[PDB]
Amino acid sequence: GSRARVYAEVNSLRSREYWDYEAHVPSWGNQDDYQLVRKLGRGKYSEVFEAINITNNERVVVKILKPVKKKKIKREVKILENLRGGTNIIKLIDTVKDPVSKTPALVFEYINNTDFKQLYQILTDFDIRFYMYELLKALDYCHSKGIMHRDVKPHNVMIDHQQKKLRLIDWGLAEFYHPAQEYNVRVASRYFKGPELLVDYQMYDYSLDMWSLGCMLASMIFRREPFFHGQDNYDQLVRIAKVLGTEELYGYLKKYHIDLDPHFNDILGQHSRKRWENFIHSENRHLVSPEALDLLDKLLRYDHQQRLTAKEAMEHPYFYPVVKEQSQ
Ligand SMILES: O=C(CCC(=O)NCCc1ccc(Cl)c(Cl)c1)NCCCCn1cnc2c(Br)c(Br)c(Br)c(Br)c21
Ligand SMILES: [Cl-]
């Protein structure tokens, strides 16, 4: 069976308490120290507000959780605690409850979420390299901590383009990696789902996040956002196969003994693998380089186990200008 190439044993080498989130007992502080100022977003299991800590005037973000998901709350809390101090991971300041209702909430550091008003037109080639490198630091960190994010997408990446700060948010779908464990494929968001999810392959790993990363890189350098625009989960795989090829998909399935839902036979068609240069034109040529294409080609691979790790991606020549500026 399939196994991560990196970080495969790291949870088993740690104390059980590190990964046994069901046994975790958070310490719940007092939400009454926080004044909600403005709604920032809302999801199936939470709602997010900008807030002030009235005791010290600190601006923060409060994610109020639907309380019935007790196991899922412990999971997210323990993951965030394990990731404390990780580079470019959103900082969990505290875990609090309304002291009367006991509804739990998470308090995060505030970030300026730049409102990109022109579909990222303002970001240069160097900016894309710089922020991709920052995002990869977060993914290498969490993977090294035995955790898969499982919902990497633009919505979950805060960038303060004033201060050049990046944070990976929303750890509510994240999960500990244990070799040979079969995971639920109902994770990630449609456009960022790896082929393994779309073909119902449960034995996936950190490399799922690297597919999502690759989708983001393709959309940044080519300016087609999202890059793979499925109308539903079936069509999502078709959109991928139109680029990566159908014979190539079947070789992946064969390698891992993956059964394909037969509804796909009526919609996949026959598609030759496309050269990445096909996506270049006058509107994106300034963001595309041989290095970018080589990196992308090594991320957007069917075979999860052969995709670059976050560290291998960071070590690619595409990021040499960032590293050199980071030291010069
Ligand atoms: O608008 C966004 C981000 C959109 C966006 O384009 N990104 C940048 C993506 C990007 C772009 C270029 C590159 Cl090259 C790279 Cl790598 C990545 N997402 C919706 C916000 C939801 C509100 N929301 C929820 N939870 C929050 C938390 Br927690 C905090 Br803290 C804060 Br602040 C906010 Br706001 C929170
Ligand atoms: Cl799962």
Closest CA to 204 of 145, 262, 244, 258: 258
Q: Where are the domains of the chain?
A: 1-19+111-328, 20-110
Q: Is the dihedral of CA 205, 211, 213, 216 positive or negative?
A: negative
Which residue minimizes the CA distance to atom 1 of ligand 1? 155
Which residue minimizes the CA distance to atom 6 of ligand 1? 154
Is 115 known to be catalytic?
no
Q: Where are the alpha helices (DSSP H) in the chain?
A: 16-19, 70-82, 125-144, 195-198, 207-222, 233-244, 246-256, 290-299, 310-314, 320-327
What is the Cα 170 distance to its own chain's centre? 9
113 pocket-lining for ligand 1 (C-beta < 6 Å)? yes
Report the alpha-carbon distance of residue 171 to residue 52 in Å, rounded: 22
- Which tokens go with 300? 């957007």
Q: Give the resolution in Å.
A: 1.0
Measured CA to CA in angstroms, residue 129 lies from 40, 132, 219, 232 at distances of 28, 5, 13, 31
SS3 157: strand
* Distance between start and end Cα atoms, the chain: 45
SS3 265: helix
159 Cβ contact list (under 8 Å, min separation 6) = 113, 114, 131, 165, 166
In the set 94, 151, 205, 209, the catalytic residue is 151
47 pocket-lining for ligand 1 (C-beta < 6 Å)? no
Report the alpha-carbon distance of residue 95 to residue 194 in Å, rounded: 32
From which experimental method does this structure derive? X-ray
Q: How many CB atoms lie within 10 A of CB 23?
A: 10
Q: How many CB atoms lie within 10 A of CB 321?
A: 16
64 pocket-lining for ligand 1 (C-beta < 6 Å)? no
Amino acid at 82: N
Measured CA to CA in angstroms, residue 278 lies from 182, 224, 284, 305, 306 at distances of 37, 13, 12, 26, 23
